[PDB]
């Protein structure tokens, strides 16, 4: 302002950015086998 004349200018600006990525997992595998022989029929148990 100079002296009548008056001037005023105000500017405001804000920005915000956010990113969140999360991944959690588990996989399990297990195999077991057997084999046997027996050299009366009652013993088959």
């Amino acid at each position: 302002r100079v002296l009548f004349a008056k001037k005023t200018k105000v500017e405001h600006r804000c920005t915000t950015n956010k990113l969140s990525e999360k991944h959690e997992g588990s996989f399990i595998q297990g195999a077991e086998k057997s084999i046997s022989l027996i050299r009366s029929e009652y013993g088959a148990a």
Partner: protein
Amino acid sequence: VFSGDGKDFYRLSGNVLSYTFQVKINNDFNYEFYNSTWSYVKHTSTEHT
């Protein structure tokens, strides 16, 4: 024929050559188990003023 792992008695014949009382049994097993699990999560947030 004598009683071997069976009934009281058994009768063979001339054409039959042999009878056996040897009990032999075998076995085999193949068991499997598994599990496959997946988990994907994603998130985003943006604010402007």
